Curated annotation (Swiss-Prot):
SUPFAM superfamilies reported for this sequence: L30e-like
InterPro entries reported in the protein's UniProt record: Ribosomal_eL30 (IPR000231), Ribosomal_eL30-like (IPR039109), Ribosomal_eL30-like_sf (IPR029064), Ribosomal_eL30_CS (IPR022991), Ribosomal_eL8/eL30/eS12/Gad45 (IPR004038)
Descriptive protein name: Large ribosomal subunit protein eL30
GO CC annotation: cytosolic large ribosomal subunit
Keywords of the record: Ribonucleoprotein, Ribosomal protein
Taxonomy, superkingdom: Archaea
Family listed: Belongs to the eukaryotic ribosomal protein eL30 family.
GO-annotated molecular function: RNA binding; structural constituent of ribosome
Source organism per UniProt: Sulfolobus acidocaldarius (strain ATCC 33909 / DSM 639 / JCM 8929 / NBRC 15157 / NCIMB 11770)
GO terms for biological process, alphabetical: translation
RNA sequence: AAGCCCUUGGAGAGCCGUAACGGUGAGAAGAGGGCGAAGGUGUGAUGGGCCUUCCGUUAGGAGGGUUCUCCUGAUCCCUAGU
């Protein structure tokens, strides 16, 4: 997973944070979403509800928002990642 | 006003902020808003009560003024922190 995520952020277009990627999910404008396991429960089952209405891949990350933020290189936590453009990586088949 | 809420917005190797601790992608600053102390300002009140002058000096009667610019201040009151 980390191999594709390295390539995804190098060339693709990405959205960090719950609020911005939650609105795009309701209108069906994200290719895919990855969720860390430490996200708040009220927001996690909102992701799962709106995902069944549009057939968008959902990936459940094992770690927390801190080692998900560190993978992106961003100095603080990111709990939800919205994939709006794959770029050239091969992540969207998961 | 503090505090807590609501839309928008989208930040980092940084920004915002306190008397201090601090806050932030689980969404900061910036823009607008909602609920919101003690008190204050009007009305209550050409009502009083306060200072004062003159006459008759019995009973009383007839007038005048009650404005303006600042400072300090609780161990009383309400409001948030830690």
């Amino acid at each position: 997973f980390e191999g594709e995520l390295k390539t995804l952020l190098r060339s693709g277009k990405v959205i960090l944070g719950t609020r911005k990627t939650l609105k795009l999910l309701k209108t069906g404008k994200v290719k895919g979403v990855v969720v860390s396991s430490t996200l708040r429960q009220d927001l996690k089952d909102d992701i799962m509800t709106f995902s069944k209405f549009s057939d968008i891949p959902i990936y459940l990350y094992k770690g927390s928002g801190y080692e998900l933020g560190t993978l992106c290189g961003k100095p603080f936590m990111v709990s939800v990642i919205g994939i709006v453009d794959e770029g050239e990586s091969k992540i969207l088949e998961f």
